[PDB]
Amino acid sequence: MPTLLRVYIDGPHGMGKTTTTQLLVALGSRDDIVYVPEPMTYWRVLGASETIANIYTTQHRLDQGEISAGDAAVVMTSAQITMGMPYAVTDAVLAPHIGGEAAPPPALTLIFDRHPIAALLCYPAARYLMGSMTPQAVLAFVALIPPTLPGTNIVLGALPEDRHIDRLAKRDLAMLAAIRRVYGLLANTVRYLQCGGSWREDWGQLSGPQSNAGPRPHIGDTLFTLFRAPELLAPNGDLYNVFAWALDVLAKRLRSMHVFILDYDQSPAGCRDALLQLTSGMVQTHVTTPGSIPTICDLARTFAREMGE
Amino acid sequence: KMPTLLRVYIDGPHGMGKTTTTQLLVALGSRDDIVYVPEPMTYWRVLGASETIANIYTTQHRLDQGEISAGDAAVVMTSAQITMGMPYAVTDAVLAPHIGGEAPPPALTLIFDRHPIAALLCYPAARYLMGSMTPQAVLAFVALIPPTLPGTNIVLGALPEDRHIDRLAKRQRPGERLDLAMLAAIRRVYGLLANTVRYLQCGGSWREDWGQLSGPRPHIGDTLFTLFRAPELLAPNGDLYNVFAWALDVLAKRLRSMHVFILDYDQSPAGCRDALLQLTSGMVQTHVTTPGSIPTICDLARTFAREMGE
Ligand SMILES: Cc1c(C=C(CO)CO)n(C)c(=O)[nH]c1=O
Ligand SMILES: Cc1c(C=C(CO)CO)n(C)c(=O)[nH]c1=O
């Protein structure tokens, strides 16, 4: 079978993900690489009206005291469903085309602006840290994360907080801190799981980044530490089983991902070349049918045309 | 080489049976070869949030009275449905790796109170019909319906509307309001669901028949696809956006491989129990994937019941 390379560019907004991605795509002949872009049209028009604006307005109103936490939570939960929809459908229709992990060049490279976990895990977790989502809803989103397809390469981003702030300022610091922390925790969680970490065994070590390499992180430095919330704990002090099962699901979904960290602290071309070097260690898969490749290409471009800026 | 499992999802519009029927299902679970995963009412009232059912029925009542906007209702209904479906979704996710291919009596019969589609498709669709959920949010839920595993046996109920109204009036849930418009919406959605599975299983192609919504198997107008001719989902030229069309492809793939069985509730609780048992004769069993799968499943089910069963 022909092989496919799927790369999800993810991590906090405002680091240079989109520019870097576009530059990499530009290196290729038109047909050997396809970009599945940020579905901004869905978010602004098709799925609802101006979802990004509604999200930031709601946080501000919460921080202002103009609305309750309960009010903010219903809006954020509802908005995240809208945010995530294009990711989730794309995954669902891609799935039957993806074979086992397969190296000679891929017939097709597919590059995504974000993975489903952005909308179903990372942004909800950060909203939770900001007090505008309940941890129960975060775990409900976790339970709905689709089964992790073979060859799921995710690229996260590193950038000094000062440079990140400036970059964002030139073009909500608590939210920026929150999302940066969540993605750092994510990277550690994947490493923890691939080093054989069992959250149930280490749960009691709780009380108070990089994948790809390094030693096993402490559970206190992974996403698992976020869910010690009193909302989730029974009178005896343990997690209710329903929430423990969501953490089992979190573990299963993350542990088979291939995570890479891109240093965005350089020029656009430098980021591009760094991303290119990173793809040399990424996992390809076979496809299901010979016609899978043109189908995937059509799917991505259709997506791009309809939901892209 | 692995033992066999029978999964049975008791679903359909709520309020058709009796708490006597339920007690028999609990009593049915007394056997060593059967476990009954009950309604996670404790999750909905306390664990996942506070009085979710009440929230739902109050929100619709106030939309109907004009005390809140449709938009306000929709954000509440959407987030409440997330809470409602969470126990179904985690359960399915943890059970999924234990399920093998299709497979004489089964080693274990697992009987669930509802399938994830109740909270990710059917109730959201009914609320769309009640004007309290956007059709975009419904398709977002559809996009997250877990893959349909082998041996997905779903039992839906038949009962005359008058008798259903009667039974429902006598067993309202905490915070529930007796809404005849909602009863009609939910009954229609489940009727459309049943037709949809047939349409699909008889080779129906929604993309091919789509034009007939504006012009042997059910007519597409008698399936769930008719709901998604909603104008919110259409371009200025009337075409469905691809993103929603893809969600309908997912809907078709999820529904086609479900095995649907209709339980006549117009009888006694004991009758209903016997009817359900016999129905299992035509249900599809699967293998489990590991020797330790059976006892793991049992543990999950028992733990679920004890923690979230009322
Ligand atoms: C994906 C995602 C985002 C991020 C973007 C939209 O501004 C682009 O990075 N944001 C900001 C959010 O609040 N929720 C989300 O699910
Ligand atoms: C499953 C489900 C129900 C049904 C039940 C809860 O009362 C009955 O089991 N209801 C009433 C609802 O509003 N949303 C749902 O997702």
XYZ file of C-alpha atoms and ligand atoms in Angstrom:
651
model
C 0.000 0.000 0.000
C 0.983 3.671 -0.423
C 1.886 5.337 2.875
C 0.544 8.431 4.609
C 2.131 10.858 7.038
C -0.293 12.704 9.312
C 1.047 15.647 11.308
C -1.053 17.658 13.765
C 0.409 21.061 14.609
C -0.977 21.990 18.018
C -0.139 23.765 21.252
C -1.026 27.229 22.522
C -2.268 29.835 20.079
C 0.025 32.714 19.163
C 3.381 30.933 18.793
C 3.629 30.896 14.995
C 2.018 27.521 14.235
C 0.077 28.690 11.185
C 2.937 30.528 9.509
C 5.294 27.610 10.136
C 2.791 25.162 8.702
C 2.119 27.229 5.595
C 5.847 27.600 4.952
C 6.331 23.819 5.146
C 3.422 23.231 2.762
C 5.005 25.789 0.399
C 8.144 23.620 0.144
C 6.136 20.898 -1.531
C 4.738 20.383 -4.979
C 0.973 20.973 -4.825
C -0.082 17.309 -4.599
C 2.498 15.741 -2.249
C 1.266 17.675 0.814
C -2.182 18.990 1.822
C -3.095 21.406 4.595
C -6.226 21.010 6.731
C -6.433 24.611 8.032
C -8.040 26.312 11.007
C -11.819 25.966 10.426
C -12.440 29.669 11.199
C -15.479 29.858 8.932
C -17.186 27.101 10.928
C -16.474 28.906 14.197
C -17.517 32.330 12.977
C -20.486 31.509 10.738
C -21.503 27.920 9.983
C -21.528 26.315 13.443
C -22.648 29.433 15.331
C -22.096 33.183 15.235
C -18.616 34.456 16.234
C -17.742 31.666 18.677
C -14.270 33.019 19.506
C -15.769 36.401 20.414
C -18.483 34.796 22.543
C -15.825 32.773 24.406
C -13.654 35.770 25.260
C -16.677 37.944 26.148
C -17.926 35.292 28.576
C -14.568 34.904 30.336
C -14.310 38.700 30.737
C -17.867 38.919 32.113
C -16.981 36.180 34.599
C -13.781 37.945 35.640
C -15.858 41.112 35.971
C -18.511 39.526 38.182
C -21.236 40.315 35.645
C -22.150 36.600 35.413
C -21.863 33.547 37.670
C -19.524 30.583 37.277
C -22.502 28.362 36.481
C -23.507 30.746 33.706
C -19.977 30.921 32.318
C -19.700 27.110 32.430
C -22.775 26.445 30.270
C -21.548 28.912 27.648
C -18.003 27.530 27.566
C -19.100 23.894 27.449
C -21.538 24.664 24.634
C -18.920 26.718 22.751
C -16.289 23.952 22.991
C -18.657 21.495 21.314
C -18.860 23.963 18.405
C -15.127 24.560 18.445
C -14.420 20.828 18.262
C -16.927 19.703 15.652
C -14.736 20.148 12.526
C -11.860 18.248 14.213
C -14.154 15.416 15.239
C -15.842 14.940 11.863
C -12.567 15.066 9.972
C -11.209 12.365 12.263
C -14.307 10.212 11.834
C -14.185 10.239 8.034
C -10.398 9.841 7.891
C -10.444 6.810 10.198
C -11.490 4.013 7.804
C -8.666 5.011 5.439
C -5.900 4.609 8.014
C -3.985 1.341 8.195
C -1.174 0.112 10.429
C 2.041 1.988 11.160
C 4.506 1.602 8.305
C 11.247 4.701 5.571
C 10.711 5.747 1.913
C 8.756 9.029 1.345
C 5.001 9.019 1.999
C 2.667 9.142 -0.998
C 0.905 11.955 0.830
C 1.628 14.170 3.806
C -1.456 15.572 5.582
C -0.822 18.517 7.896
C -3.511 19.655 10.349
C -4.031 22.895 12.217
C -4.743 21.205 15.591
C -5.840 17.742 16.746
C -9.273 16.906 18.330
C -7.660 16.981 21.823
C -7.226 20.739 21.493
C -10.996 21.229 21.711
C -11.846 18.089 23.726
C -9.090 18.321 26.339
C -6.631 21.199 26.301
C -8.805 24.283 25.956
C -11.469 22.850 28.311
C -8.731 22.063 30.876
C -7.475 25.649 30.633
C -11.021 27.041 30.980
C -11.325 24.854 34.073
C -8.153 26.488 35.453
C -9.778 29.847 34.694
C -12.869 28.836 36.646
C -15.198 28.920 33.640
C -15.648 25.152 33.236
C -16.364 22.388 35.753
C -13.899 19.506 35.937
C -16.836 17.136 35.373
C -17.475 18.685 31.963
C -13.754 18.513 31.116
C -13.867 14.762 31.848
C -17.038 14.373 29.800
C -15.094 15.879 26.873
C -12.200 13.480 27.630
C -14.534 10.478 27.519
C -15.573 11.585 24.005
C -12.030 11.849 22.557
C -12.010 9.553 19.492
C -9.853 6.391 19.490
C -6.290 7.393 18.640
C -5.497 6.463 15.047
C -2.182 4.807 14.183
C 0.520 7.306 13.189
C -0.848 10.208 15.199
C 2.086 12.632 15.203
C 1.463 15.748 17.259
C 3.765 18.762 17.270
C 3.627 20.973 20.337
C 5.418 24.296 20.696
C 8.068 25.787 22.968
C 8.408 29.552 23.389
C 9.633 31.695 26.296
C 6.643 33.254 28.065
C 8.061 36.744 27.520
C 8.434 36.240 23.755
C 4.991 34.607 23.598
C 3.407 37.511 25.461
C 5.066 40.067 23.176
C 4.080 38.186 20.058
C 0.503 38.064 21.271
C 0.549 41.687 22.440
C 1.798 43.030 19.100
C -1.124 41.321 17.372
C -5.844 37.578 28.639
C -2.527 36.716 30.286
C -4.239 34.361 32.735
C -5.637 32.329 29.838
C -2.235 32.389 28.124
C -0.644 31.100 31.341
C -3.404 28.484 31.664
C -3.143 27.138 28.130
C 0.699 27.127 28.232
C 0.565 25.155 31.483
C -1.973 22.682 30.073
C 0.124 21.934 26.988
C 3.257 21.540 29.103
C 1.319 19.070 31.257
C 0.156 17.294 28.097
C 3.712 16.757 26.880
C 4.707 15.370 30.284
C 1.652 13.107 30.339
C 2.546 11.435 27.064
C 6.129 10.900 28.290
C 4.882 9.571 31.661
C 2.641 7.032 29.932
C 5.290 5.922 27.423
C 7.739 5.413 30.294
C 5.158 3.000 31.712
C 3.526 5.337 34.216
C 0.304 4.056 35.792
C -1.810 6.906 37.159
C -3.773 4.642 39.497
C -0.509 3.499 41.126
C 0.832 7.054 41.556
C -2.452 8.769 42.477
C -1.461 9.009 46.145
C 1.757 10.867 45.220
C -0.450 13.843 44.453
C -1.024 16.605 47.036
C 0.574 19.891 45.975
C 8.633 19.920 29.681
C 9.253 17.395 26.911
C 7.989 14.170 25.519
C 10.183 12.392 23.005
C 12.979 12.253 25.603
C 14.000 12.443 29.247
C 13.038 10.434 32.316
C 9.573 9.604 33.670
C 7.854 12.737 35.003
C 6.170 12.818 38.427
C 2.372 12.524 38.209
C 2.167 15.983 39.783
C 3.629 17.334 36.528
C 1.098 15.600 34.244
C -2.545 16.320 33.370
C -3.603 13.841 36.067
C -2.819 16.420 38.760
C -5.649 18.635 37.465
C -8.356 16.206 38.546
C -7.799 16.128 42.310
C -10.718 18.537 42.521
C -13.034 18.171 45.529
C -15.913 17.992 42.997
C -14.503 14.664 41.794
C -13.666 13.116 45.170
C -15.956 10.900 47.280
C -16.391 11.524 51.045
C -13.766 8.843 51.704
C -11.263 10.856 49.660
C -10.913 8.828 46.450
C -12.027 9.679 42.920
C -15.496 8.503 42.102
C -15.147 5.583 39.702
C -16.876 7.437 36.887
C -14.110 10.050 36.908
C -11.406 7.404 37.391
C -12.685 5.730 34.216
C -12.388 9.015 32.309
C -8.743 9.163 33.416
C -8.271 5.601 32.164
C -9.624 6.848 28.820
C -7.272 9.852 28.904
C -4.344 7.457 29.470
C -5.345 5.114 26.638
C -5.817 7.966 24.113
C -2.537 9.773 24.890
C -0.198 6.827 25.383
C -0.114 5.854 21.697
C 0.497 9.383 20.373
C 3.883 10.408 18.968
C 4.677 13.832 20.370
C 7.327 16.304 19.212
C 8.312 19.718 20.507
C 9.080 22.502 18.072
C 11.074 25.514 19.232
C 9.252 28.563 17.850
C 11.875 30.945 19.243
C 13.352 31.685 15.793
C 12.571 33.282 12.414
C 9.681 31.899 10.308
C 12.065 30.078 7.934
C 14.000 28.662 10.875
C 10.748 27.327 12.370
C 9.939 25.771 9.001
C 13.275 23.976 8.708
C 13.085 22.854 12.330
C 9.630 21.426 11.595
C 10.984 19.702 8.495
C 13.833 18.024 10.414
C 11.286 16.860 13.027
C 9.210 15.040 10.384
C 12.149 12.682 9.745
C 11.377 10.884 13.020
C 7.596 10.785 12.521
C 5.395 7.723 12.096
C 3.793 6.930 8.744
C 0.917 4.517 8.173
C -0.402 2.508 5.271
C -3.766 3.383 3.817
C -6.800 1.129 3.499
C -7.358 1.224 -0.254
C -5.247 2.429 -3.176
C -7.900 5.089 -3.811
C -7.620 6.290 -0.193
C -4.921 8.793 -1.170
C -6.908 10.799 -3.734
C -9.952 10.575 -1.455
C -8.011 12.031 1.478
C -6.667 14.798 -0.730
C -10.196 15.710 -1.869
C -11.473 15.620 1.701
C -8.730 17.957 2.917
C -9.124 20.480 0.090
C -12.919 20.416 0.426
C -12.467 21.123 4.140
C -9.946 23.849 3.354
C -12.181 25.601 0.819
C -15.301 25.506 2.923
C -14.050 26.112 6.448
C -10.780 27.916 5.850
C -10.266 31.689 5.950
C -11.075 -19.442 22.144
C -12.569 -16.617 24.227
C -15.915 -16.680 26.080
C -18.969 -14.972 24.556
C -20.785 -11.807 25.584
C -24.332 -10.578 24.992
C -24.779 -6.818 25.220
C -28.315 -5.469 25.373
C -29.144 -1.762 25.424
C -32.639 -0.994 26.697
C -33.405 2.340 25.122
C -36.227 4.205 23.389
C -38.467 6.970 24.745
C -38.449 7.057 28.561
C -41.628 6.531 30.579
C -43.022 3.496 28.753
C -42.460 0.862 31.422
C -42.946 0.618 35.186
C -40.598 0.719 38.197
C -41.862 -2.833 38.683
C -40.430 -3.683 35.258
C -37.130 -2.154 36.368
C -37.061 -4.101 39.648
C -37.345 -7.293 37.578
C -34.300 -6.128 35.557
C -32.426 -5.608 38.824
C -33.756 -9.016 39.881
C -32.674 -10.340 36.495
C -29.158 -9.189 37.372
C -29.203 -11.382 40.502
C -28.051 -14.289 38.333
C -24.329 -14.914 38.004
C -24.549 -14.839 34.207
C -26.297 -11.451 33.961
C -25.482 -7.927 35.108
C -27.839 -4.943 34.778
C -26.174 -1.515 34.438
C -28.824 0.892 35.701
C -29.786 4.486 35.027
C -27.022 6.766 36.352
C -29.488 9.069 38.156
C -26.976 9.908 40.904
C -24.572 11.201 38.266
C -27.242 13.513 36.791
C -28.654 14.801 40.137
C -25.408 15.119 42.132
C -22.050 13.878 40.747
C -21.747 15.496 37.313
C -23.829 18.550 38.188
C -26.834 19.566 40.287
C -30.308 18.340 39.265
C -29.641 18.104 35.521
C -33.127 16.794 34.698
C -34.670 19.755 36.539
C -32.393 22.134 34.680
C -33.540 20.675 31.377
C -37.269 20.819 32.035
C -37.130 24.242 33.676
C -35.194 25.644 30.715
C -37.722 24.390 28.178
C -40.636 25.647 30.284
C -39.118 29.124 30.409
C -38.366 29.127 26.679
C -42.017 28.212 26.080
C -43.188 31.015 28.414
C -40.898 33.431 26.589
C -38.836 34.195 29.672
C -35.595 33.288 27.841
C -34.309 33.344 24.257
C -33.883 30.272 22.056
C -30.153 30.986 22.144
C -30.132 30.960 25.946
C -32.053 27.687 25.969
C -29.712 26.105 23.423
C -26.511 26.671 25.433
C -28.165 25.201 28.519
C -29.585 22.181 26.673
C -26.281 21.510 24.924
C -24.233 21.559 28.125
C -26.890 19.568 30.027
C -26.777 16.862 27.325
C -23.014 16.604 27.818
C -23.670 15.858 31.500
C -26.467 13.401 30.700
C -24.362 11.345 28.293
C -21.081 11.244 30.226
C -21.750 7.962 32.083
C -22.780 6.274 28.793
C -19.688 7.559 27.030
C -17.101 6.532 29.668
C -18.737 3.145 30.016
C -18.548 2.550 26.262
C -14.948 3.776 26.094
C -13.685 1.455 28.859
C -15.702 -1.509 27.528
C -14.627 -1.119 23.879
C -11.202 -2.858 24.056
C -12.866 -5.913 25.629
C -15.166 -6.456 22.625
C -14.121 -8.882 19.901
C -15.728 -10.129 16.701
C -19.155 -11.745 16.311
C -19.800 -15.226 17.698
C -25.693 -21.315 22.124
C -25.940 -19.476 25.492
C -23.455 -16.624 26.237
C -21.036 -16.638 29.184
C -22.262 -13.216 30.278
C -25.220 -11.039 29.413
C -24.689 -7.346 30.028
C -27.930 -5.344 30.131
C -27.610 -1.552 29.938
C -30.060 1.168 30.807
C -29.612 3.129 27.527
C -27.001 3.438 24.783
C -24.806 6.531 24.165
C -27.034 7.500 21.180
C -29.840 8.438 23.615
C -27.823 11.392 24.858
C -25.694 12.029 21.747
C -28.472 11.791 19.140
C -32.049 11.153 20.215
C -32.669 13.596 23.068
C -30.596 16.311 21.330
C -32.685 15.793 18.173
C -35.925 16.021 20.173
C -34.744 19.271 21.755
C -33.932 20.558 18.250
C -37.605 19.798 17.421
C -38.584 21.675 20.599
C -36.626 24.707 19.399
C -34.177 24.448 22.306
C -31.091 23.068 20.490
C -29.395 24.154 17.246
C -29.155 21.493 14.505
C -25.390 22.251 14.376
C -24.975 21.155 18.019
C -26.921 17.973 17.274
C -24.497 17.113 14.439
C -21.553 17.919 16.711
C -22.881 15.301 19.139
C -23.424 12.891 16.212
C -19.794 13.399 15.172
C -18.752 12.055 18.595
C -20.943 8.960 18.620
C -18.512 6.141 19.408
C -17.816 3.576 16.643
C -20.459 0.869 16.539
C -18.994 -2.350 17.918
C -20.131 -5.846 16.905
C -23.096 -7.157 18.870
C -24.681 -3.755 19.415
C -28.245 -4.850 20.262
C -30.614 -1.985 20.947
C -34.141 -2.435 22.259
C -36.654 0.330 21.531
C -40.204 0.448 22.843
C -43.633 0.435 21.255
C -46.620 1.786 23.194
C -49.751 3.721 22.134
C -49.342 7.425 22.908
C -52.276 7.568 25.334
C -51.006 4.647 27.390
C -47.514 6.182 27.283
C -48.864 9.501 28.589
C -50.616 7.597 31.401
C -47.533 5.669 32.480
C -45.304 8.741 32.244
C -47.664 10.833 34.371
C -47.361 8.230 37.130
C -43.543 8.046 37.121
C -42.033 11.488 36.599
C -38.327 11.798 37.413
C -36.951 14.411 39.845
C -37.279 17.832 38.224
C -39.181 16.426 35.233
C -42.176 18.290 33.842
C -44.984 16.522 32.015
C -44.511 18.050 28.550
C -46.682 16.570 25.786
C -44.818 18.477 23.074
C -41.558 16.857 24.314
C -43.231 13.442 24.554
C -44.265 13.830 20.924
C -40.808 15.046 19.856
C -39.007 12.166 21.578
C -41.505 9.560 20.294
C -41.079 10.887 16.734
C -37.273 10.872 16.971
C -37.199 7.216 18.096
C -39.690 6.254 15.384
C -37.462 8.023 12.840
C -34.459 6.229 14.361
C -36.023 2.815 13.827
C -36.907 3.751 10.216
C -33.422 5.081 9.681
C -31.729 1.811 10.639
C -34.043 -0.073 8.232
C -33.488 2.470 5.434
C -29.736 2.043 5.841
C -29.800 -1.739 6.213
C -31.863 -2.054 3.020
C -29.120 -0.208 1.153
C -30.404 3.365 1.442
C -27.980 6.109 0.420
C -28.852 9.468 1.958
C -26.772 11.429 -0.592
C -28.660 9.781 -3.452
C -32.132 10.398 -1.968
C -31.405 13.857 -0.519
C -33.047 15.716 -3.415
C -36.302 13.931 -2.591
C -36.637 16.003 0.589
C -37.376 19.006 -1.621
C -39.340 17.182 -4.318
C -37.805 -1.373 -0.683
C -37.154 0.908 2.254
C -38.621 3.914 4.040
C -38.772 7.244 2.258
C -35.891 9.445 3.410
C -38.529 11.882 4.621
C -39.416 9.223 7.186
C -35.852 8.899 8.542
C -33.607 11.074 10.740
C -32.039 12.622 7.652
C -35.169 14.720 7.119
C -34.337 16.671 10.303
C -31.098 17.899 8.836
C -32.687 19.714 5.934
C -32.579 22.526 8.511
C -31.728 25.882 6.868
C -28.964 26.562 9.414
C -27.075 23.715 7.742
C -27.439 24.999 4.186
C -25.407 27.320 1.978
C -27.180 30.246 0.208
C -27.669 27.964 -2.808
C -29.409 25.380 -0.650
C -26.585 22.818 -0.597
C -25.669 21.169 2.700
C -22.204 22.288 3.806
C -19.737 19.421 3.560
C -18.959 19.504 7.272
C -22.620 18.597 8.000
C -22.752 16.137 5.123
C -19.755 14.376 6.679
C -21.624 14.227 9.999
C -24.514 12.516 8.186
C -22.058 9.982 6.711
C -20.960 9.275 10.289
C -24.607 8.977 11.375
C -25.224 6.436 8.607
C -22.124 4.395 9.462
C -22.959 4.351 13.192
C -26.629 3.393 12.699
C -26.389 0.837 9.899
C -24.627 -1.839 11.940
C -26.936 -1.594 14.952
C -29.308 -4.491 15.578
C -32.698 -3.071 16.583
C -35.374 -4.962 18.514
C -38.811 -3.619 19.364
C -40.228 -4.369 22.835
C -43.996 -4.068 23.203
C -44.517 -2.316 26.558
C -48.306 -2.611 26.361
C -48.335 -5.496 28.814
C -47.447 -6.352 32.418
C -43.987 -5.816 33.954
C -43.576 -9.598 34.063
C -44.685 -9.876 30.444
C -42.133 -7.220 29.461
C -39.392 -9.137 31.232
C -40.235 -12.393 29.435
C -40.506 -10.633 26.088
C -37.046 -9.146 26.612
C -35.536 -12.569 27.388
C -37.002 -14.166 24.256
C -35.839 -11.190 22.164
C -32.300 -12.170 23.136
C -32.694 -15.294 20.978
C -32.204 -13.103 17.897
C -29.526 -10.886 19.400
C -25.920 -10.924 18.247
C -23.217 -12.147 20.636
C -19.539 -11.383 20.373
C -16.341 -12.806 21.765
C -14.371 -10.916 24.360
C -10.709 -10.213 23.711
C -9.029 -11.590 26.869
C -9.673 -14.342 29.458
C -9.850 -11.631 32.123
C -12.447 -9.632 30.154
C -15.517 -11.297 31.677
C -14.645 -10.590 35.333
C -13.450 -7.067 34.461
C -16.776 -6.320 32.738
C -18.749 -7.628 35.739
C -16.715 -5.445 38.085
C -17.287 -2.348 35.928
C -21.026 -3.001 35.839
C -21.343 -3.672 39.570
C -19.258 -0.616 40.412
C -21.349 1.573 38.060
C -24.594 0.348 39.630
C -23.437 0.834 43.217
C -22.041 4.302 42.546
C -24.503 5.874 40.112
C -27.587 3.670 40.305
C -30.359 5.152 42.442
C -9.010 25.500 19.495
C -9.452 26.523 20.466
C -8.946 27.790 20.554
C -7.849 28.248 19.664
C -7.935 28.949 18.519
C -9.092 29.859 18.265
O -8.780 31.133 18.767
C -6.813 29.024 17.513
O -5.638 28.625 18.170
N -9.458 28.666 21.532
C -8.973 30.046 21.729
C -10.504 28.266 22.426
O -10.959 29.023 23.289
N -11.008 26.962 22.304
C -10.522 26.044 21.346
O -11.028 24.925 21.332
C -31.045 9.946 28.267
C -31.765 11.231 28.461
C -32.976 11.356 29.093
C -33.708 10.181 29.629
C -33.718 9.661 30.864
C -33.314 10.500 32.036
O -34.469 10.967 32.684
C -34.519 8.412 31.169
O -33.593 7.371 31.338
N -33.565 12.625 29.222
C -34.879 12.847 29.870
C -32.934 13.792 28.711
O -33.456 14.904 28.814
N -31.691 13.637 28.076
C -31.053 12.392 27.917
O -29.965 12.393 27.337
